[PDB]
Design a protein around this ligand. Structure first.
Ligand SMILES: Nc1ncnc2c1ncn2[C@@H]1O[C@H](COP(=O)(O)OP(=O)(O)O)[C@@H](O)[C@H]1O
Ligand SMILES: [Mg+2]
Lengths: 93, 107, 88, 579, 98, 107, 93, 95, 86
DNA sequence: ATCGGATGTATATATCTGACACGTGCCTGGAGACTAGGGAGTAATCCCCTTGGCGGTTAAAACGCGGGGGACAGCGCGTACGTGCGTTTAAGCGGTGCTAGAGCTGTCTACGACCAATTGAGCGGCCTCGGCACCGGGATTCTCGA
DNA sequence: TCGAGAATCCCGGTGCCGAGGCCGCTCAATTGGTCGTAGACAGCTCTAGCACCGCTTAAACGCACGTACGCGCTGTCCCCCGCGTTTTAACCGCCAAGGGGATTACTCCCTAGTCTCCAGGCACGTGTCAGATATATACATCCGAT
């Protein structure tokens, strides 16, 4: 009966952004649906993008191009920067 | 040796391994890279941090200390680009931004 | 007598009462409402409901079930391009 | 005494072994089997075990002087029993028959509590709404010098009473209805409640009823139950009553079940019945209806085992094979086929004899009604579905008789007007249609003499109430119950389950109070009565362990059932010319 | 002579109080009956969950609120303040439904 | 052992093998059934024939032999079902349906 | 080199529904893109539908449901009839 | 001399019957490859790319003008004005 | 490439061209202020589509914008185009 | 109403150019073993559904009425468009050259997939105690007739 | 024009319920090792995109003038809103019994995938003709002024 969800991760992000602020169950479910929806959008865009170029791997470059295509304007660049940051850190250890 | 989660390795809060599994099982491509889950998890974390900060500010404005769907709706619809991202979405138990046309007002 | 012919049970669409349409219009932000709005609103609501429920029933019948779930309605709405957050 | 002074005693401005020790001391004077429950809930609840480890006679012969008028001797013994129960730190339920008089006994007991040991309240009385007024009168009539109020009305009236008298403590009795008790618990949760009395304790049967939980949230120094019939259908409801009455003792449902019911011992019989009689004797008091009254003559209950009609058989078999989503549909078909959509032939509709012969039961019903019309009686059909009751009303019109219908949708003033006009002196009112679970208990159909249960209910208590609608104190000529049953059908199953429930009730409770085409209706009646005697002789000698078997022989079968039951090319555009 | 509010000053108060709350403006039971009636015309003998009806109600109410916003815009565009069926039809036709 | 194409066995004109390969290599599912390509090819053939017959009728109504994008646009837009199916689709070198609002016409 | 296309099959259908007309090259390109678009929509809907029900295979049942779910009104029933006809003819061979 | 409105209707009937493009090719190509330099330097355009852009653009503009005409008619006029375009775009969801 | 970048090319979408588009759209009488609005909306639409097409071509490590890139951009924007491949 | 123009609208003829037919080859779809795992079927089970009916509360909804203000029609006018003419001016095509820069072919290597054990992380069940909802009540503010 | 009057808001108090710590387990992530095979780089080729550049010539532009249409103002109904009964339907709480769908666990079988060959089907490159322009050309067919 185990059901995976992004509840604890959303809670951790909230408690590192607003250290003293809770969240109701309905708001948590809305946040989980939002995360799932955005994940599906980006993954689908990257999948189609890789299919266009006759590739078989979804790599970080496809994810960057997809997030650049979807997220509007000034919201994209920050996200893009964040992504690159993580990858660099991840490839240092 | 000693285990280290890829999330902590990349300094993230979202699960890199779970994202990798959902990416392989979702039938998106025959293969997935090694940095794709890290990049996607970082992007998701950034977006959720943005929306959560806006919602927390909205909730604080109403002198309340829990986030409820009304605060999420109110935070999303008040930011133009976050609203472009979620233009076609309806938030259950959300509402409508206070908006009365100036023509309708008393003279 | 002939009372075995109970009643028409007028109509379920008339259950969407005029005050309900007025409240929805107020939330939409209108000041005055013509008297003929209450029929057009029922018509458009019925059309939208049929469109959504057809897809929901198709989804729940493919799964070989007999119980329409919230997830089925969510899938139907997403298919029509009206993504709904808060039910899974 | 003084309002301000009385505020110190009523309002609660603030493991209770203190009275529990004496309770157990007196209770263990009986058989040690009583301690069994305790010796269970000492392992589960060690903190309450601290009592088991360590271990006035007031006859009140004559009627109380303070009460107005004389008091009947059996009610005298009733109040004696109540006083004895009080002076033991225990509580019991009173289960006298309806019409024998219980409110008088309770108010005499309250007069005792106020005048002999001097505790003028507080007292809470919970009663059905229709009964509420019928309390204040007696409170004002038998012991006038006591104040009480009904605590009823809309939000404004109830809130005004709460602020004015309840919190003001200008009261002794706060008689209030069930829904009002649920509505305002917070203002009523702090009175410290010397006693709580629940007339018609049938409502407090389900342990998880909202009313049940609300009442368990109260604080009372002692409780009491008034009911006409405990143990209506099952046993577990009796345990629920006892648990509410004494929560420190009957605290484990599974104990009472497994010890007696949930696992029936391989013992034959006649031991566990003595166990139950010993257990319940100090708690439950009951008297036969016919005990001290005489007059009313016993009821001549009868069965009519009608067959079934050709269309009725066709429809019933159509139902058996597989828009219809219950077994109760079968009950509809054996009741009257016209309840289904489409049974009526032809979209033009008539009211001539074309429906009497189409229904099996109504044929015999028509024959009996005619025989009584040229015999001079009055009938009280008690069908269970208002839709069939409507069809029967249309029938009554066709045959040119006089209606009188009181369903569950009949307004209160219409209810009382119908009751008055029918119960009036000589009048053109032959038949009185009425649905079995309607009117509560304040219906007084004493004028008529013949009752026809058109259908049978799941629990026989409802049918007993229907019978008491005409067999109460008053009507003194004859009573004739004429329940109709369709043989070779699910009605047999329902009748069997009802009979087994009634027999279980007779065994458990009714043994304590002993020590305390036309069918030629004559031959049909003879064979039906023979079959009734057959079932009686069959099932009277059955065992207690079998009484709870609930054989549940499926009626879905009844005869042998396996439990298994172009493109058109579209319209096309005519002309495609641009011009 | 009891005081009386001028026509249109209670409409504005209703506007600004219903546009601040979040609750559903349609009664639950009539909407549930309507949903069941519509559904039983597609394939017989369905049953719904309470959550299915709730989600469907949220979606429909949001749809109607958006439609009424566009209707108000159409009415104001024509130098009016009263919304008329012409406006609903124009909004729906521009929006792409019909 | 002469080779018979699956299209011949199914009585279709569209290719079943090509559709099977496109389904397999398109990353739609882990496995692909046997009747799925046949069913999908039949549906595609039906849709193509349905649109193309209307296009041919429109071509004939204009006294032409070969059909051009204008005829396809006319056939799609005049038919309610196909106009609903291709609602969000623009057709190159198409045009518009001849339609003038009645209020604009002279009195 | 050797770019695959649907031209030959569309032409074979045309010379059985209108066996005298012709078709321009631009019209052929439009028909090819239409066939590709409809194929992609049906296949994507079927894949998502199979993913919802935890299945791992695409069968004629998912294709039929996707057809009934994407095409409007009478087109859906006509397409379903054609598909079932073809499948039943195929399996009996 | 014709009267105002006759030639407008003749042009309406003329241009709803033809299928070509109503924007000259060099002006549109210059506009496209001026806009495109805001996103990447030294970009080359195939002819087919500019042709597809032009056809999509003209289809969009025609579809917008239909809604503008309907809005102006709804407001009891026959002349389309900028507020009609703004209303159509706002209702459709683009603004 | 380096082709002596120009200005006022939005003025190249001239008044008669907008009038012809309006006539095809079914418009009889045209106000005089509508041309600037039409130019503005055209510029917005072109900017969006070209941005998406340039992103698509940059991802492929190319320097030439192909017709398929424009088609993909339009499809992503919900404006499917038939007749240029795919 | 009738007549004088201007404009589509049929109608015949020449073109060409784009569609159709025909020859090659290569690559992909079909035939035939072999296999294993996905899915169909069986069976507990159990929690929640079904229908028919009852009792009571309490807001919402329905109906009636008065009266204000808003829509709708009509009139006047005065710009702002449409229509027709001359005159340039910029598109559209042919022609030319240059070369970046897509597109195809070979090698190999670094990187993802697969597999076996292991273990921490995440989910489910449970308890409780602050945050938010509800209810006076008191003050504030906007409204509407003077 | 100010003085009631009504509605809203902001404070206290309950009180109750659900969010948020806390504990057990089990099962996906992680680590380590082996193994193909995408794709990345290097190389070669030939193709079309960039850049002018002249001719032509057809549309764009500026200009006049003169209707007619958009806008503003005025009257007049009429219809919708605000307010007051009062009636009913939603909404709980119940009763009575089924049985019926949805959800885990096992079992196994048959239908996919994976190979290995090997011939036809289809894509490319050609070489023809007829269908649709383009001109003219005469005909019929609205529009507008008397
Ligand atoms: N002096 C009296 N002694 C005993 N009973 C009396 C006296 N006076 C009246 N009664 C009867 O006591 C009855 C109370 O019984 P009833 O009202 O049927 O309720 P319940 O059945 O619950 O006791 C009344 O009906 C009334 O007729
Ligand atoms: Mg009584």
């Amino acid at each position: 009966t185990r059901k995976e969800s992004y509840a604890i991760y959303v809670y951790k992000v909230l408690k590192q952004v607003h250290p003293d602020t809770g969240i109701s169950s309905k708001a948590m479910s809305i946040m989980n649906s939002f995360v799932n929806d955005v994940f599906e959008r980006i993954a689908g865009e990257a999948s189609r993008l890789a299919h266009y170029n006759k590739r078989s791997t979804i790599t970080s470059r496809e994810i960057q191009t997809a997030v650049r295509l979807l997220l509007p304007g000034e919201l994209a660049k920050h996200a893009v920067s964040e992504g690159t940051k993580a990858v660099t850190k991840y490839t240092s250890a | 040796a000693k285990a280290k989660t890829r999330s902590s390795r990349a300094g993230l809060q979202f699960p890199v391994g779970r994202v990798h599994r959902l990416l392989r099982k979702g039938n998106y491509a025959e293969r997935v890279g090694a940095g794709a889950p890290v990049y996607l998890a970082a992007v998701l974390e950034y977006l959720t941090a943005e929306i959560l900060e806006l919602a927390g500010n909205a909730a604080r404005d109403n002198k309340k200390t829990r986030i409820i769907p009304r605060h999420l709706q109110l935070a999303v619809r008040n930011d133009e680009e976050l609203n472009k991202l979620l233009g076609r979405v309806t938030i259950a138990q959300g509402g409508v931004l206070p908006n009365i046309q100036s023509v309708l007002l008393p003279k | 007598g002939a009372k075995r012919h109970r009643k028409v049970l007028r109509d379920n669409i008339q259950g969407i009462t005029k005050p309900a349409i007025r409240r929805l219009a107020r939330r939409g932000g209108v000041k005055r409402i013509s008297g003929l709005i209450y029929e057009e609103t029922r018509g458009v609501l019925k059309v939208f409901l049929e469109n959504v429920i057809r897809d929901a029933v198709t989804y729940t019948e493919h799964a070989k079930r007999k119980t329409v779930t919230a997830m089925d309605v969510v899938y139907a709405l997403k298919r029509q391009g009206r993504t709904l957050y808060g039910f899974g | 005494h003084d309002p301000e002074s009385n505020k110190k005693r009523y309002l609660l401005k603030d493991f209770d072994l203190e009275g529990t020790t004496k309770r157990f001391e007196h209770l263990l004077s009986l058989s040690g089997l009583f301690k069994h429950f305790i010796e269970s809930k000492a392992a589960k609840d060690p903190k309450f075990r601290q009592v088991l480890d360590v271990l006035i006679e007031f006859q009140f012969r004559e009627s109380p002087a303070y009460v107005n008028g004389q008091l009947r001797p059996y009610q005298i013994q009733g109040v004696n029993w109540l006083v004895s129960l009080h002076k033991n730190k225990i509580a019991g339920i009173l289960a006298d028959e309806m019409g024998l008089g219980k409110t008088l006994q309770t108010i005499s007991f309250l007069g005792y509590l106020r005048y002999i040991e001097k505790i003028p309240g507080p007292f809470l009385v919970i009663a059905p709404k229709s009964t509420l007024n019928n309390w204040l009168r007696e409170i004002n009539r038998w012991t006038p010098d006591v104040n009480a109020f009904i605590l009823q009305g809309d939000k404004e009236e109830r809130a005004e009473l709460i602020q004015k008298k309840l919190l003001g403590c200008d009261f002794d009795v706060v008689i209030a209805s069930y829904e009002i008790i649920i509505r305002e618990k917070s203002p009523l949760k702090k009175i410290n409640w010397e006693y709580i009395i629940i007339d018609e304790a049938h409502r407090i049967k389900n342990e998880e009823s909202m009313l049940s939980q609300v009442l368990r949230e109260f604080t009372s120094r002692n409780r009491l139950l008034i009911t006409g019939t405990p143990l209506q259908n099952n046993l577990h409801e009796l345990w629920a009553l006892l648990n509410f009455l004494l929560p420190d003792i009957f605290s484990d449902a599974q104990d009472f079940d497994d010890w007696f019911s949930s696992e029936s011992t391989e013992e034959d019989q006649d031991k566990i019945v003595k166990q139950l009689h010993t257990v319940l004797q100090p708690f439950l008091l009951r008297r036969i209806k016919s005990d001290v009254e005489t007059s009313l003559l016993p009821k001549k209950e009868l069965n009519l085992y009608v067959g079934m009609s050709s269309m009725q058989k066709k429809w019933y078999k159509k139902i058996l094979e597989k828009l219809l989503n219950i077994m109760m549909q079968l009950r509809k078909c054996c009741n009257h086929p016209y309840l289904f959509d489409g049974a009526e032939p032809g979209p033009p509709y008539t009211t001539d004899e074309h429906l009497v012969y189409n229904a099996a039961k109504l044929q015999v019903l028509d024959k009996l009604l005619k025989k009584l019309k040229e015999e001079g009686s009055r009938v009280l059909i008690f069908s269970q579905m208002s839709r069939l009751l409507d069809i029967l009303e249309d029938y009554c019109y066709f045959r040119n008789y006089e209606y009188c219908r009181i369903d569950g949708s009949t307004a209160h003033e219409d209810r009382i007007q119908a009751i008055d006009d029918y119960n009036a002196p000589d009048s053109k009112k032959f038949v009185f249609l009425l649905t079995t679970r309607a009117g509560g208990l304040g219906i007084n159909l004493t004028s008529a003499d013949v009752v026809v249960l058109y259908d049978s209910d799941w629990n026989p208590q409802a049918d007993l109430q229907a019978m008491d609608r005409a067999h109460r104190i008053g009507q003194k000529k004859q009573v004739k119950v004429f329940r109709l049953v369709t043989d070779n059908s699910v009605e047999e199953k329902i009748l069997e389950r009802a009979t087994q429930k009634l027999r279980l009730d007779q065994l458990v409770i009714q043994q304590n109070r002993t020590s305390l085409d036309d069918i030629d209706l004559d031959e049909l009646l003879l064979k039906s009565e023979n079959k009734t005697k057959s079932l009686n002789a069959k099932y009277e000698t059955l065992g207690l362990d079998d009484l709870q078997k609930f054989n549940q022989d499926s009626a879905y079968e009844w005869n042998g059932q396996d439990f298994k039951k172009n493109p058109t090319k579209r319209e096309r555009k005519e002309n495609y010319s641009i011009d | 002579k009891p005081h009386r509010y001028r026509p249109g000053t209670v409409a504005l108060r209703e506007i600004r109080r219903y546009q601040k709350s979040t609750e559903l403006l349609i009664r639950k039971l009539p909407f549930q009956r309507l949903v069941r009636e519509i559904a039983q015309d597609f394939k017989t003998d369905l049953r719904f969950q309470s959550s299915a009806v709730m989600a469907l109600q949220e979606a429909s109410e949001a749809y109607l609120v958006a439609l009424f916003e566009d209707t108000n815009l159409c009415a104001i565009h024509a130098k009016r303040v009263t919304i008329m069926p012409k406006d609903i039809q124009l909004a729906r036709r521009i929006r792409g439904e019909r």
